[PDB]
Amino acid sequence: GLFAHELFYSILLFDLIYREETLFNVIKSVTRNGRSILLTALLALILVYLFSIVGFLFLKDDFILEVDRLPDSTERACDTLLMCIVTVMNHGLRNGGGVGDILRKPSKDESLFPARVVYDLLFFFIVIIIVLNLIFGVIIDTFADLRSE
Amino acid sequence: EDPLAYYENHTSQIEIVRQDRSMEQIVFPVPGICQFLTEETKHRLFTTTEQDEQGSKVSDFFDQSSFLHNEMEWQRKLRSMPLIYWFSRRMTLWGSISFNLAVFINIIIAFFYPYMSIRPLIVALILRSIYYLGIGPTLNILGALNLTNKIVFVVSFVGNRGTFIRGYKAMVMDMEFLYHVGYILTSVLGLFAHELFYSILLFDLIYREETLFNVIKSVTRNGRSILLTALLALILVYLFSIVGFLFLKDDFILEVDRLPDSTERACDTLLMCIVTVMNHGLRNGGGVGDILRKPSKDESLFPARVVYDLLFFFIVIIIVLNLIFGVIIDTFADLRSEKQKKEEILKTTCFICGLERDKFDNKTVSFEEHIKLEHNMWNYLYFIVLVRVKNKTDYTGPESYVAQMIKNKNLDWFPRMRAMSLVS
Numbered sequence: 300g301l302f303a304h305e306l307f308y309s310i311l312l313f314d315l316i317y318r319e320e321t322l323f324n325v326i327k328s329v330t331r332n333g334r335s336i337l338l339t340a341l342l343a344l345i346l347v348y349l350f351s352i353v354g355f356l357f358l359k360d361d362f363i364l365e366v367d368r369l370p371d372s373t374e375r376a377c378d379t380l381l382m383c384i385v386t387v388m389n390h391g392l393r394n395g396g397g398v399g400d401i402l403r404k405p406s407k408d409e410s411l412f413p414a415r416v417v418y419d420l421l422f423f424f425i426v427i428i429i430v431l432n433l434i435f436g437v438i439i440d441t442f443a444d445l446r447s448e
Numbered sequence: 449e450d451p452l453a454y455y456e457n458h459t460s461q462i463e464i465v466r467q468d469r470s471m472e473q474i475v476f477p478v479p480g481i482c483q484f485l486t487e488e489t490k491h492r493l494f495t496t497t498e499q500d501e502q503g504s505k506v507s508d509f510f511d512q513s514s515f516l517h518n519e520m521e522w523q524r525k526l527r528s529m530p531l532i533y534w535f536s537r538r539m540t541l542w543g544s545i546s547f548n549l550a551v552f553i554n555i556i557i558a559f560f561y562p563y564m565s566i567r568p569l570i571v572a573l574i575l576r577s578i579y580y581l582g583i584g585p586t587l588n589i590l591g592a593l594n595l596t597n598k599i600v601f602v603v604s605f606v607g608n609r610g611t612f613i614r615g616y617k618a619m620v621m622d623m624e625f626l627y628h629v630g631y632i633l634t635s636v637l638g639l640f641a642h643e644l645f646y647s648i649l650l651f652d653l654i655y656r657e658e659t660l661f662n663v664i665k666s667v668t669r670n671g672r673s674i675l676l677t678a679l680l681a682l683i684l685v686y687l688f689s690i691v692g693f694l695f696l697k698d699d700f701i702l703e704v705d706r707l708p709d710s711t712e713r714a715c716d717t718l719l720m721c722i723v724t725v726m727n728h729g730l731r732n733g734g735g736v737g738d739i740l741r742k743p744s745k746d747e748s749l750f751p752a753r754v755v756y757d758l759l760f761f762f763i764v765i766i767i768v769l770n771l772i773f774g775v776i777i778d779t780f781a782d783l784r785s786e787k788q789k790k791e792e793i794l795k796t797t798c799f800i801c802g803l804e805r806d807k808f809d810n811k812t813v814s815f816e817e818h819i820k821l822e823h824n825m826w827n828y829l830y831f832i833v834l835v836r837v838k839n840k841t842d843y844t845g846p847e848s849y850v851a852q853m854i855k856n857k858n859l860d861w862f863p864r865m866r867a868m869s870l871v872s
């Protein structure tokens with residue numbers, strides 16, 4: 300911080316955890332069973348991979364994402380499986396509804412409307428409602444375990 | 449080398465309560481067949497046996513005695529047969545290569561499709577194979593190796609677990625064997641029909657990692673409650689859709705993009721209104737109000753729309769949906785409590801007699817000595833095996849008594865809540 304660059308002093312703010320015991324105890328809830336949280340994240344990634352495979356196989360066209368170009372306003376985000384997986388992981392997990400939020404809005408007359416509805420609901424229930432909340436459940440359980448000990 | 453050492457190693461003792469309710473100690477030689485019992489089986493039995501209503505594990509131990517004896521015989525035969533023994537001993541290894549091969553295949557498929565520790569070395573070899581032969585050929589070789597390794601793994605599994613000993617019907621009944629054959633079928637499909645079929649193989653992580661299985665147990669233990677809560681949410685959505693159709697049809701306008709007007713009515717029919725509500729209100733943080741048309745203050749139905757939106761948000765989004773997460777947290781707490789109680793019982797109670805550690809305080813014989821020598825479950829199992837093997841004519845007094853109790857299905861010969869050392 301003194302010599303290379305002034306902004307390097309930002310890392311020093313982490314000393315609050317060392318100084319305060321309460322904050323360290325709070326973080327211990329996350330760290331005690333961090334392996335379980337990481338494995339839950341891996342399971343979420345596997346489910347995202349399977350959902351992306353299904354979408355690429357059957358729902359490729361629906362993956363149209365808007366883009367703002369620095370100096371067309373839409374792009375295809377499921378032309379390749381890697382791109383489709385990246386799109387799902389980045390957007391569906393960060394969106395409350397799920398992947399259906401970014402996915403194109405389907406019309407009723409379209410024959411694939413029931414399939415899209417099932418896809419969106421299954422993603423929302425399996426990943427957003429169940430898997431993503433398992434990490435918070437693990438943290439809550441760790442809190443109680445630490446308190447009891 | 450040392451006769452005394454050999455005899456002490458091969459000699460065991462147990463304690464039995466006679467008909468007159470007096471305790472006696474029986475010193476017997478270990479049966480030869482007993483040596484073939486596996487540490488994995490011993491640990492599984494010790495950590496899985498469950499207490500009965502009276503709180504005794506003796507019943508389950510006695511029930512599994514016969515299966516343990518059959519496993520011992522099968523293990524002796526497997527040891528006699530060399531090559532299959534070599535394959536069985538390395539069961540963990542085969543699973544390791546299988547999991548690594550599946551992970552690598554899936555990574556390559558994800559990173560290239562559509563197309564046309566030694567782990568770093570394997571990665572470098574795979575990279576060179578991709579560079580020289582090509583992505584498709586590399587995937588073919590990887591899949592062939594995966595299938596061969598899985599065949600070897602299933603062979604080792606049947607050799608080690610000895611599921612076939614119980615019977616063909618039992619083998620088919622076993623869920624793990626069915627999972628393994630499903631893995632073989634999925635590998636075959638991935639190799640021969642379509643490359644993307646390898647994706648299902650990534651589910652092996654749950655089987656491999658105990659922690660992830662325990663985490664998923666929080667969702668599976670009380671899944672019926674979660675499904676019933678979902679049904680309640682569906683019923684509430686149905687009622688809300690009824691109300692909207694009757695009083696608020698016009699507000700149900702959903703924007704759409706037409707593949708090569710921009711707004712289409714969504715509540716013309718009650719089925720469509722139900723579908724719209726279930727699909728959007730439940731997946732929207734605000735609820736059905738967000739999708740519904742924005743009302744002006746001057747409009748007459750403004751208070752009705754406000755009440756509708758707020759009621760939906762509070763009843764469904766804030767209460768009904770959160771009940772599933774509450775159930776999951778509840779199951780987590782229940783599982784932790786059960787595990788803690790089981791661990792405490794196992795650590796601080798004797799398997800056979802059930803006496804607690806505190807009872808042995810300030811005594812000549814320690815609790816560790818009691819569990820190791822005086823009351824050893826494996827010693828009782830060895831005595832049972834001795835009774836079964838030995839001929840009736842050669843039975844001694846205690847052996848005849850225990851054999852008669854076994855025949856009559858009476859477990860009283862086991863010492864319950866009594867220890868000779870504590871008495872004297």
Ligand SMILES: Nc1ncnc2c1ncn2[C@@H]1O[C@H](COP(=O)(O)OP(=O)(O)OP(=O)(O)O)[C@@H](O)[C@H]1O
Pocket residue numbers: 494797798799800819820823824825826
């Ligand atoms: N009745 C019991 N209650 C509690 N723990 C028991 C009981 N019987 C055995 N154990 C424990 O189960 C494990 C099996 O003990 P075992 O006699 O096989 O010892 P070992 O160290 O594997 O054998 P060795 O040292 O003789 O080669 C040990 O942890 C023993 O303490």
Ligand SMILES: [Ca+2]
Pocket residue numbers: 840841842843
């Ligand atoms: Ca005789």
Ligand SMILES: [Zn+2]
Pocket residue numbers: 798799800801802803818823867
């Ligand atoms: Zn005991």
